[PDB]
């Protein structure tokens, strides 16, 4: 096994209690893209380095998502042949959902192959008039709860990373695409760098980072990392169980005030389990989960079952917000990976402190 150039400068990572499942999903009429074990292994191991280095940078130690390792530089990838041709699992109209329901049956019959509740599902590109090894597509490519979907094509190989070529440009688009789709699988919403992080570190991965990964600076936000800190496959505490039950948090006494360039957020919280952290999201309308690539995020540590929180936010960090209506969301993140939000709407032209 040879180590590609991009993987030569790498850090050691803590061992995790649970590992991200990797599935190479084949339609009954589909052959794999040749050499995929090596090619996707290198790409997933570099991605693991990226998440771990960003986690370490934000103070959480050398923690990334776990992977089941088969042998040196090779991930233990489940090769799955499906009951139906690939036409039955397209990008549009529930292709992903159908592919997932079949894997749920696979993992219920083969429980030793399931290493966590998070799965990344990879399908070879279609080859027709619209798509092919030159312009991949046709297959699921998104987050779906704790399942996410990416694709494979012959030149999907890390040796093209950063290269000013068609393969390099193609790789950044579909590698960053995979990086962000996986992000969604790891409990992450869309977000946008602050103005100062945009200057220091570049592009948030869960914003437009799917177009920059491997070519210009790309990074994870403090809010993204606060969520990864409560993600099952980042855990180094085996006694902590994840995602069971419902998120139970009472939030009280909220106040959001505007004194100058500062936004002041404060309040109370109570929950039967530890609340690890608070993420704050600020965006323009419209607000739906796929209209929020503009949500500028902030994060603060909490760490108690019951307590108080208080944050100051600089209005000048709100890079890209241009609308008179804006919404502030407060996401409370629990020790077991569940979270819940409260939203609050404001108008710069009629700006009123929130006080309940």
């Amino acid at each position: 096994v040879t180590v590609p150039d991009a993987l030569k400068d790498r850090i050691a990572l803590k061992k995790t209690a649970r590992q991200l499942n990797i599935v190479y999903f084949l339609g009954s009429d589909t052959e794999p893209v040749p050499d995929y074990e090596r090619r996707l292994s290198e790409l997933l191991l570099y991605l693991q380095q990226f998440y771990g280095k960003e986690m370490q940078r934000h103070g959480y130690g050398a923690r990334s998502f776990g992977l089941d390792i088969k042998s040196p530089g090779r991930v233990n990838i489940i090769e799955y042949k499906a009951k139906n041709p690939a036409a039955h699992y397209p990008y549009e109209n529930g292709g992903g959902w159908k592919a997932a329901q079949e894997l749920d049956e696979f993992f219920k019959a083969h429980p030793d192959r399931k290493k966590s509740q998070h799965t990344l599902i990879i399908m070879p590109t279609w080859n027709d008039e619209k798509n092919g090894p030159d312009n991949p597509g046709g297959v699921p490519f998104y987050g779906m709860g704790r399942n996410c979907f990416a694709l494979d094509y012959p030149a999907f190989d890390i040796k093209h990373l950063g290269q000013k070529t068609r393969e390099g440009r193609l790789l950044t688009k579909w590698y960053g695409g995979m990086a962000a789709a996986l992000g969604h699988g790891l409990n992450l919403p869309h977000n946008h760098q602050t103005a100062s992080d945009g200057k220091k570190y570049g592009t948030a991965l869960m914003g437009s980072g799917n177009y920059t990964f491997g070519t210009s600076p790309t990074f994870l936000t403090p809010a993204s990392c606060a969520l990864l800190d409560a993600c099952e496959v980042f855990s180094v505490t085996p006694s902590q169980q994840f995602y069971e039950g419902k998120p139970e948090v009472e939030v009280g006494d909220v106040a959001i005030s505007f004194k100058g360039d500062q936004i002041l957020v404060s309040g109370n919280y109570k929950s039967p389990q530890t609340v690890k952290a608070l993420n704050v999201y600020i965006q323009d309308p419209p607000y739906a989960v796929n209209q929020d690539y503009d949500a500028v995020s902030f994060s603060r540590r909490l760490g108690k079952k019951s307590g108080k929180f208080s944050m100051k936010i600089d209005k000048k960090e709100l890079e890209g917000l241009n609308n008179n209506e804006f919404r502030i969301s407060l996401m409370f993140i629990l020790a077991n990976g569940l979270h819940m939000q409260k939203h609050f709407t404001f108008h710069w032209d009629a700006l009123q402190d929130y006080r309940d």
């Binding site: 992903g96 490519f141 998104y142 987050g143 779906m144 709860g145 695409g177 962000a180 789709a181 969604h184 919403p189 869309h190 914003g207 437009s208 799917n210 177009y211 739906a288 989960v289 796929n290 690539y293």
Partner: peptide
């Protein structure tokens, strides 16, 4: 509560 899938940036 409904949970929509998260697609990438146009």
């Amino acid at each position: 509560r409904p949970y929509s899938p998260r697609p990438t940036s146009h």
